[PDB]
Amino acid sequence: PLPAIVPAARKATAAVIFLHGLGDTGHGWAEAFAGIRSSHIKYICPHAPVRPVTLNMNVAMPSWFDIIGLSPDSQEDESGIKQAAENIKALIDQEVKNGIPSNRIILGGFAQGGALSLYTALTTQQKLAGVTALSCWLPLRASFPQGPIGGANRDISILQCHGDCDPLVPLMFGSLTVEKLKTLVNPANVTFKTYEGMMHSSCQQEMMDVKQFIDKLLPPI
Numbered sequence: 531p532l533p534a535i536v537p538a539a540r541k542a543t544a545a546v547i548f549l550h551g552l553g554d555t556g557h558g559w560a561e562a563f564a565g566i567r568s569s570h571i572k573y574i575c576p577h578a579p580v581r582p583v584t585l586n587m588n589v590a591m592p593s594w595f596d597i598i599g600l601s602p603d604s605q606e607d608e609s610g611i612k613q614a615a616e617n618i619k620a621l622i623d624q625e626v627k628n629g630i631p632s633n634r635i636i637l638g639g640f641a642q643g644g645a646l647s648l649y650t651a652l653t654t655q656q657k658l659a660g661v662t663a664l665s666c667w668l669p670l671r672a673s674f675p676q677g678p679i680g681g682a683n684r685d686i687s688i689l690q691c692h693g694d695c696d697p698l699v700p701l702m703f704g705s706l707t708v709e710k711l712k713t714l715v716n717p718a719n720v721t722f723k724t725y726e727g728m729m730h731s732s733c734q735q736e737m738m739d740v741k742q743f744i745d746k747l748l749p750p751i
């Protein structure tokens with residue numbers, strides 16, 4: 531259905547597109563971003579389609595792409611990630627058609643959605659304002675060139691968050707992802723923040739770190 535949105539009180543001069551995690555909807559994150567909303571920023575939380583998930587023996591659940599395993603050597607749904615990223619590209623392009631330029635748009639997500647937002651930002655030619663990647667990883671690591679990506683977003687700013695007690699997406703997945711991100715874009719704009727005791731969820735301190743990151747890269751007027 532239609533994405534869960536936190537409308538800008540005013541006119542929207544910026545936008546945040548946040549992608550939920552596996553099995554979720556956009557409603558919960560939309561409500562979370564309502565608590566850190568800035569009156570000139572529209573917040574968009576799309577809903578992943580219900581689809582079979584291989585690791586659950588194809589029980590159908592909301593998922594941006596198929597998951598085969600949790601190990602860093604598990605085969606990844608290459609065509610699904612790529613096609614899902616193309617859907618997010620279209621979601622960014624329509625916000626531009628409606629008024630908000632892409633360089634006024636932050637793309638982000640949590641876990642599977644955070645993986646998708648990272649892949650999308652690093653492979654699209656639309657210039658984005660930044661990335662907020664929570665408790666996630668870089669999908670299709672080895673498909674990336676061996677140096678900087680170059681192109682639109684080679685200087686994109688990435689705030690990446692992770693809980694140090696995550697049992698599902700281990701903390702070392704995020705830190706290694708941040709190591710890869712530092713070789714893919716300008717490392718002076720890549721921030722890795724860890725939250726002690728936090729598992730595979732979010733905390734208010736992280737939500738306020740996220741707002742501080744959004745408010746600086748997307749200030750008014």
Ligand SMILES: CCCCCCCCCCCCCCCC(=O)O
Binds near residue numbers: 599600601641707
């Ligand atoms: C960058 C190196 C580490 C990551 C290498 C690939 C690991 C992929 C496995 C992670 C799948 C996690 C399942 C999603 C959970 C959720 O969406 O909440």
